[PDB]
């Protein structure tokens, strides 16, 4: 009963995320011209989540079948796209947080920072910064057959003399750069943003405007809560298994792939959290 419900959850998250990212991408392509910087960021985020959602049925297959019956080329490309566009998604979210932070706290610099050209330059820099890990995943990613278990695995091959050490090192680098720095930046940016907005005479001028401020605050809290609740468990779980203790339990395997499903669920919820709640995207849609 458990594998059917787990694969059903994976199927739901996959379909919802693909339809979401597709509708958002289509609207940015045709309905609304990319003249602002915000729509450019939403475009790159939708593209990153659309390329991250593609990986999900392959992981489902690896979970259920326990074997990878495909070629090595597909292994290498799926690994490179998954890592590359996951880092691209997280850095896009962090740059959107920094952009809105500069927009609110430094309004005079916002005139010299919210240019579409500058936004494009920054986004090309984010994609290039991801390209280092992308090329590393193309070079190191591959397929290896295991004789005693008589099963083939798709994974990041490292030399086996120091496989556990270089694997632990890579996991600490990935965890720190993709989690500790973006979380702290998003907390500092949105905290200073709310503290700055509380000192705005317009926001505290009337009860209705105060309600609008409350709604903006609720939105910020929701976005940060979703990001923390979705990324924190799988990162802690991977770190504990990597160093604290090694085990292999059925229930632990289900919880492991459930936390992976939650991590992809964040990417599936990102179109609803970011496009279908902006007050300007609504007026473009209507």
């Amino acid at each position: 009963a458990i594998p059917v419900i787990i694969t059903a959850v994976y199927s739901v998250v996959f379909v919802v995320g693909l339809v979401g990212n597709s509708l958002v991408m289509f609207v940015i392509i045709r309905y609304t011209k990319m003249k602002t910087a915000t729509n450019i960021y939403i475009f790159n985020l939708a593209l990153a989540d659309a390329l991250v959602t593609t990986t999900m049925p392959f992981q489902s297959t690896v979970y259920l079948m326990n074997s990878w019956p495909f070629g090595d080329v597909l292994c290498k490309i799926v690994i490179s796209i998954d890592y590359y566009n996951m880092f691209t998604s997280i850095f896009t979210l962090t740059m959107m947080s920094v952009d809105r932070y500069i927009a609110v706290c430094h309004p005079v610099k916002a005139l010299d920072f919210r240019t579409p050209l500058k936004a494009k330059i920054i986004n090309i820099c984010i994609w290039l910064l991801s390209s280092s890990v992308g090329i590393s995943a193309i070079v190191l990613g591959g397929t290896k057959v295991r004789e005693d278990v008589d099963v083939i695995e798709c994974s990041l091959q490292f030399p086996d003399d120091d496989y556990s050490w270089w694997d632990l090192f890579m996991k600490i680098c990935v965890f720190i750069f993709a989690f500790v720095i973006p979380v702290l930046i998003i907390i500092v940016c949105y905290t200073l943003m709310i503290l700055r907005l509380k000192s705005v005479r317009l926001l505290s001028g009337s009860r209705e405007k105060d309600r609008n401020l409350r709604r903006i605050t609720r939105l910020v809290l929701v976005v940060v809560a979703v990001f923390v609740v979705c990324w924190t468990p799988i990162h802690i779980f991977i770190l504990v298994e990597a160093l604290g203790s090694t085990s292999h339990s059925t229930a632990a395997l289900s919880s492991y792939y459930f936390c992976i499903a939650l991590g992809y669920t964040n990417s599936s919820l990102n179109p609803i959290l970011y496009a279908f709640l902006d007050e300007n995207f609504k007026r473009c849609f209507r």
Binding site: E153, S155, L156, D167, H248, Y256, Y257, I260
Partner: peptide, 8 residues
């Protein structure tokens, strides 16, 4: 991400 690792 998680799936493409060495898990036993």
């Amino acid at each position: 991400y998680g799936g493409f690792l060495r898990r036993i």
